[model samples]
Target: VVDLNNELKTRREKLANLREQGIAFPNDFRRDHTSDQLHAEFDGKENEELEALNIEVAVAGRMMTRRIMGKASFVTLQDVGGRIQLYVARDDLPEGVYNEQFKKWDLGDILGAKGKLFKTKTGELSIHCTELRLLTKALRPLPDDQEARYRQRYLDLISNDESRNTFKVRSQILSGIRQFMVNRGFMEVETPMMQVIPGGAAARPFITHHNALDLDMYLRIAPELYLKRLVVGGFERVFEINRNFRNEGISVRHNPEFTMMELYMAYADYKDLIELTESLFRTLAQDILGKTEVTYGDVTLDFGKPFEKLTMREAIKKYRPETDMADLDNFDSAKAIAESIGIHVEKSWGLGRIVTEIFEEVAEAHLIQPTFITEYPAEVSPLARRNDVNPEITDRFEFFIGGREIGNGFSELNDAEDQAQRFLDQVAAKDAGDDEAMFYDEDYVTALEHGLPPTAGLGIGIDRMVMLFTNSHTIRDVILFPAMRP
Candidate 1:
């Protein structure tokens, strides 16, 4: 076992000694290039070519590794771009600076070095130092446990390259989504995050008090209704990539607050959104990762190929072959089947709800590849357009990959009367103890009365998308700072 207290005391003593020297945490050093920038420019050049060019650079980063000899040492500096080796000899720097100060520095110390770029005998691109300075002193050592690492993200970022890449790719994914929407002539718009009535999704809204109004306000569960209101107001195509707050449980796949890319397009149906969803994922994968086929866990997700489409009942039958297709058509039979599969039938649930519950219990896990399950029950999808042939079902589709729902899109429900009735039903459910039911928003209904064109709306969970692209199994892995109990 190591002496943790002693280690901390040693670092503190070093800092105290440095305090006696003037400007211990000096900010005077200015770096001209990043570690990767130097490597990118000089890695292609031969050692002889580099020697002829005589390139010099000022680089700054935290010291990560050191190999000390009698009078010479090699230290690795990790910068924002990447890590690069610094060749520090006793004679190279100003007299006594190397052995006296550099030798005393710890691994996590932030420093700056000015040096000429060169190739070592082993063909590694490195810096030959002429001057060096300590930029900052890290007070604590990096944590080792994964749980502790999540609590201390800066330490994780410094120690793990994979963690850095995950966040970098997440940033790229956001940019790529914005570019994709803009290229398709969609106007990016902002919507209210805190509102009087949160009616967008079938989830509980996070409650907050508006001090000025002396009323209860809510953080939006989804931006679906506001985007649709814009659709009614003649913004032909619009999108908003932002956060949605939900008062829900936390899990490997869930967070209380999450990022969502919600978009609505006028004169489009669910099919158009389906095509757009496919193209968007394929483009993001190829552009950000340079490949369409991604290895997620043990499964390889193929975005290049066409995604398979199936009705909800068809999906249940496909996965559970022994399921009676006839039994899924009626309430009594569906409830019996659901109960047989260990799902307790809710007292208020209808035939549509029972069918959906059966599908979720039996089929969701087997949806490993890119698949779109359509014809969701209208009872559950209150905002989706009902089918002409079967009013019980709606023209909704949810995209899945690696057995997880990534996106939901549908031909939007536009009839004012139908929407009002749905709202009443939701209110009834809410009164009957379903906390996740939506609240009736009179202004949204008023907007629909002004005539909303045939529109398709979609919402893709940005956190889950980042997880797939980064091969991150947990939602917290992609999120920079996740909530934890104090």
Candidate 2:
């Protein structure tokens, strides 16, 4: 446990002393020209020219360092937005203020400086201050350990530059996504964060209760169902970047509350979605990094070229060569193959589950480049339409990049009867002890009866996408305030 130790107690005492002198330990001070702006406006000019420019500037930031002398002093203030030296001479100050008050102030205190800009003898642009005032005092020291940093995010943002940059890049990525969609004539829309039925994806949902109405609600696991409902209302061109809550365990890749971008296009199919999404990704790559390729850790990814596309069966074969066509022909064949390979199976488990499991185990990691693994099992895809040629497989595809699944997209199932059956299937699975089965939404089936247009939709994990674009290794690294254990 931390205590107000010597350093903190000393800071508190200083605060008391300031208050006793009619100082508030801080005062509102206006600052002009950010440190970067300060440099940008006068970095290139000669020292003599800058001196003649008489660039008087007021800057505010934390005091990082101070080196004192008898009649003059050299100080560094970190707010000149990284750091710029403050040449504070006692002679320039009002009489004995420097030796008495300025020397008494401690490090970590925020100060505002009024100064003129010029290069020193060392060729560094610095602020030659005529006046300095204490802005605020820090009661506690900044801790270096990351656990404390995450627990106290404000301190972390102020102390660490890289941690601060991660969020800035995160914002830029979201803006770029919005820009790409808006340029192509897509309208941004919002859906209910809490829903009567959470039927977007096959994940457990967080249970919430309404007190006044005495009704139970579930935080949306995905905005998929409602976004499509908007399509039924003739709002065809729509997208939503929103938060989703899932009752799941946390990992480097998984968070309970996460952000996702779900977009739907009218009169389009899964292939159209692939084209637009791929284009959006390439544009984002160029916009954020000014390059068509980005390096995430050791892997160099190219977002410019067309992403590779393959069916699920091809991916399974490519990775597991030993499993031939005959072995995938029937449940018995597949079951025998899986058992022989030391993979367990239940009596209720069918060919689809086994196929998906095998792909995740064998094929997922081998797909290092951007690849679309298509033809998901119909049973697993509750909201996706099945292919007319192959009733057993849905027209669905999952995008994988850097050895992780980045997104999932498919054609919508607009047939109310078929959707009802799918929901019933999920109910049956739920009754059969599958906790992750989606809940049946009768209202959604009712909306489908009103006829949703032939549409293509995609759901991208914003956190995961940010993880890739920012070279962030974990989901927690990009999340602002991740859920932490008490």
Candidate 3:
């Protein structure tokens, strides 16, 4: 801590000196190559070959590390692409320029160097600098604390290779997802982030006030309603990759604002969505990472293999062997079973809710592999199509990996009457004191009345997906600027 403070003061003094010279932050230097570019084109060549070619390049980046030995020094430069080394000798530059200008520069200072690419005696690729100039002076040093790293993400990105690479992989995953969707003939679209009524998901929404109308609106909890409305308007295959804000508690798994890719496919069922999900994941894993086996912490998630499928009842039964299917089927019996399992049975909860809660409590964490839990209850899935034969359960599925729900999909309910009744049920639940119950959206019901085709829709939490791919345990790690407490 003492050294850090001393170094900070010293850096400030140095910056003051640069200011005295009126050259503290010049931006005229141009670079011909990044670290990765030079490495790619020249790393394979032998020292003899490099000497023969005598390739000159101008490179610019932050001075990451330095080894000064009075007359000569070698420093590592970290650019956006990667890192490269520069060897600077006092005798090689203009008389006294090396000592007066280069020697006093701080570690975090950005520099632009024009040099000839060469190989060191140890056979490492390097730049023998002919000219070097300071580009930017970083006043503050990189922080060591994780909390500070999160709060000051630029410092984290500048100093930590792991943090930078995680975001890089995150970008790759997003682009890969977009390309996959585009190739599969899904049109990307955008919907309003603020809505009059948030009806898509069973979650409390962040409310905002409109000045013009003097009405309170909600930051959308999900784009499901608007996207479905588009589906009704005859855009058969549409997808949206954007933010969804929910007024919810923060955790390692959740944030108030999160990214999700919500898509609806016409003439498709939940079964079709399942197949598509499997293919999408497999393709993403293989393409982005070149393997289907993803190492998420202690577990190896295999996306290449066929994902295991189980019903909600079967999942609970598998994890809790003592539970009976007959008991799960009956409302009172399920309520008793739930209470026995330490669940506080709420008045607003029905048999489906109780069963779903049981599944969450007992079976959710045990689903470490990629597995799809299907046959969700209609009481819990208000906007999903009910099973034709049963009429009580919805043809919905939620897939889990590393014991976390990554995606949710279902055959969307197109029946206006059924949807209206479900909305009434939600309103009743809300009236009965369920804050998370969805609002009754009359317009969405009207859209359904306008005839939405048989559609299969899915929402994949992009943040969670990035966490899986990057082996990031906390949602905050993958997110550049996660919500934090004041």
Which structure among the candidates has the greatest lDDT? 3
Give all TM-scores, in the order shown. 0.96, 0.96, 0.97
* lDDT scores in order: 0.89, 0.84, 0.90
lDDT of 3: 0.90
After aligning candidate 3 to the native by TM-score, how far in Å is the CA of 52 from where it should be?
1.8
State how far residue 243 of model 2 sits from its true place (Å): 0.6
- Cα lDDT of model 3 by residue, 1-486, tens digit: 688888889888988888888867787898989988889888889988888898899999989899998899999999999999999989877787799888878788889988888899888899999988899987866454467777778887887888888999999999999999999899999999999998689888898999999999889999899999999999999999999898889865788999999999999999999888898888888988888888989889988779999998889989999877899878899999899989999988988899999999999999998899999888999999999899989999999988899999999999999999999999999999899998889888898998999999999989888888888999999999887766
Q: Which ten residues in a row have the lowest lDDT in candidate 3?
A: 140-149
Q: Deviation in angstroms for 50 in model 2?
A: 1.5
- Residues 429-476 of candidate 2 have per-residue lDDT tens digits of 888878888788888888899999999999998998988888888888
**Model 1 stretches astray by more than 4 angstroms:** none
Total clashes for model 2: 1
Clashes of each: 0, 1, 0
